[PDB]
Amino acid sequence: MVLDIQLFRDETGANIIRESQRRRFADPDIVDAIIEADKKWRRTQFLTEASKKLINICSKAVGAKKKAKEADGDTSEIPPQVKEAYENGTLKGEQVEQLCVLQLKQLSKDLSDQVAGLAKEAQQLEEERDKLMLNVGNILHESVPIAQDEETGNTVVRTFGNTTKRAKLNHVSIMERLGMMDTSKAVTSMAGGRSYVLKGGLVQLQVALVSYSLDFLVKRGYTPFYPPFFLNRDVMGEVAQLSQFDEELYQVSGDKKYLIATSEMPIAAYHRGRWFTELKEPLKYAGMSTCFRKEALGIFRVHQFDKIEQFVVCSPRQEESWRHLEDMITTSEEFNKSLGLPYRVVNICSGALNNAAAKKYDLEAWFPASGAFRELVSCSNCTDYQSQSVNCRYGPNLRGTAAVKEYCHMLNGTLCAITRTMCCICENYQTEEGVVIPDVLRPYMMGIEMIRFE
């Protein structure tokens, strides 16, 4: 499953999607292609259900005839009119009951063959529909800036700290001069491009950030969550876009699995097929994992890195998820303030948003030696988009309920991308002697106040 079809079948709903597509500078005609694919699919289903019912009538009519000792009949040959009627979904049970046992047996096999063919057609139409749904963006929030390009289109909403100060050495030079980061051929000849070894004080800093970040979220009511780092193909497909398989995900062979690019992937997948009748309190998770990205200088952009993640599952009602999005970006802001790191928060323009996000805020920290704002955090409200894909339902779940389906809302937000935060700390806390440890991290690394240049 990719998206629920329900909004596409509704005239008003389809227009909401077309409008959102236009506002994202995406194709509104994808809605119409989905409606058409679904129309063809609904036709295979109408015929399948009609023919399944007629198969049961054949079985019951044969049973009645056998009990009555009616002769089996002259022939099994099916009238062309009967074949035309079941192919068009107009064959009535009263007409089927006019056939002899031999014809009823032949018809049951013919209808079973038709159901088998219609199932193959339906599977192809579901594949076409699903491929189109992957190109449908989530319905934009009304506050999303309307623009194609990030450089001019994104809106700066807040800033913190000294964002104009400059510094001498960039994070690459600092980590080299500490003697605590190795990205030389000794490492890349054994592990490939962009691989690294961290030593001594930088490992202590890495662990101090992992533990401080986890405690920061525990204090805010998040439940720590340590996931498996592998996901099977089917499950990864529900939490990843098709473009992620070719550009971002490593394949593991032990069956075929994929390494996770973020704990958001197994946390969202952990909710698949779930149904929360009510969520008076949201589900809040502090994901902790290594992240693996194929990405097809230093430790700013690497294939392997730790990240502490915020993940929320909440009620889709009363715009509650929008309140959670504000709390999640505020949490990431408070985290950076606690580390004394200057930054700006940016509202991502419509054209730059990934399909699952209805709105996204990035926190870009100031790197004084690099002289630039660099992304440390992304916080998104995915509303019911991922829930539709993992099939995470919401609402009353009682016996006797017939065919609007409600889904939970889901949000995800970086709390700390460990290696990038280390790069940021190094630039902001450098001195002539080394790197000053931010105050809040000192208890998490044996009270160490500074890591020295070698």
**Interface positions, 386-405, toward Na ion (CB under 5 A):** 398, 401
x-or-dash string of contact with ligand FZT, 302-331, rule CB under 6 A: x--x-x-x----------------------
Is 81 or 401 the residue whose CB approaches Na ion more closely? 401
- Give the length of the chain: 454
Our finding on whether 264 is near ligand FZT (CB under 6 A) is yes
* Residue 84 near residue 92 (C-beta atoms within 8 A): no
Q: How many CB atoms lie within 10 A of CB 439?
A: 11
Closest distance between Na ion and the C-beta of residue 172, in Å?
Answer: 6
* Residue 5 near residue 36 (C-beta atoms within 8 A): no
Was 176 annotated as part of a binding site?
A: no
Going by the DSSP 8-state scheme, the letter that residue 440 receives in this structure is G
Q: Rounded to whole angstroms, how far apart are CA atoms 196 and 185? A: 10
Was 305 annotated as part of a binding site?
A: yes
Our finding on whether 271 is near ligand FZT (CB under 6 A) is no
Is 33 or 252 the residue whose CB approaches its own copies more closely? 252
Closest distance between Na ion and the C-beta of residue 257, in Å?
Answer: 24
Our finding on whether 386 is near ligand FZT (CB under 6 A) is no
Residues that bind its own copies (CB under 8 A): 186-187, 189-192, 195-200, 202-204, 206-207, 210-211, 214-215, 218, 223-232, 235, 250-255, 257, 259, 266, 269-270, 272, 286, 288, 290, 292, 294, 296, 303-304, 444, 446
Where would I find the beta strands (DSSP E) of 261-394? 275-276, 283-292, 304-314, 343-347, 359-367, 372-381, 393-394
Closest distance between ligand FZT and the C-beta of residue 251, in Å?
Answer: 19
Q: What single string gives the DSSP state of each residue in 239-288?
A: HS-HHHHHHTPPEEE--EEEE-SSTHHHHHHHTTT-EES--SS-EEEEEE
- Looking only at the bridges linking them, the beta strands covering 359-367 and 275-276 are unpaired
Q: Rounded to whole angstroms, how far apart are CA atoms 10 and 33? A: 15
Was 421 annotated as part of a binding site?
A: no
Q: Choose the one of ligand FZT, its own copies, Na ion, none that binds residue 223, judging by a C-beta under 5 to 8 angstroms depending on kind.
A: its own copies
Among 332, 370, 383, 412, binds Na ion (CB under 5 A): 370
The region that residue 163 occupies, defined by phi over 0 for left and psi between -120 and 50 for alpha, beta otherwise, is alpha
Distance of CA 305 to the CA centre of its chain: 19
Was 65 annotated as part of a binding site?
A: no
Q: Choose the one of ligand FZT, Na ion, its own copies, none that binds residue 52, judging by a C-beta under 5 to 8 angstroms depending on kind.
A: none
Was 376 annotated as part of a binding site?
A: yes
Going by the DSSP 8-state scheme, the letter that residue 140 receives in this structure is P
Q: Choose the one of Na ion, its own copies, ligand FZT, none that binds residue 23, judging by a C-beta under 5 to 8 angstroms depending on kind.
A: none
Was 449 annotated as part of a binding site?
A: no
Is 190 or 446 the residue whose CB approaches ligand FZT more closely? 190
Closest distance between ligand FZT and the C-beta of residue 416, in Å?
Answer: 9
Was 9 annotated as part of a binding site?
A: no
* Residue 14 near residue 35 (C-beta atoms within 8 A): yes
Q: Rounded to whole angstroms, how far apart are CA atoms 132 and 45? A: 20
Q: Choose the one of Na ion, ligand FZT, its own copies, none that binds residue 225, judging by a C-beta under 5 to 8 angstroms depending on kind.
A: its own copies
Q: Choose the one of its own copies, Na ion, ligand FZT, none that binds residue 414, judging by a C-beta under 5 to 8 angstroms depending on kind.
A: ligand FZT
Q: Rounded to whole angstroms, how far apart are CA atoms 250 and 293? A: 7
Q: Which residues have CB under 8 Å from 217's CB, separation 6+?
A: 224, 286, 308, 310, 331, 415
- Under DSSP, is residue 98 helix (H, G, I), strand (E, B) or coil? coil
- Going by the annotation, the residues of the binding site for ATP are 293-295, 302-305, 375-378
Contacts with Na ion, residue ranges (CB under 5 A) = 162, 164, 170, 370, 378, 398, 401
- Residue numbers at the binding site for ligand FZT (CB under 6 A): 262, 264, 293, 301-302, 305, 307, 309, 375-378, 412-414, 417, 419-420
User: Residues annotated as binding site for L-serine?
Assistant: 262, 293, 309, 412
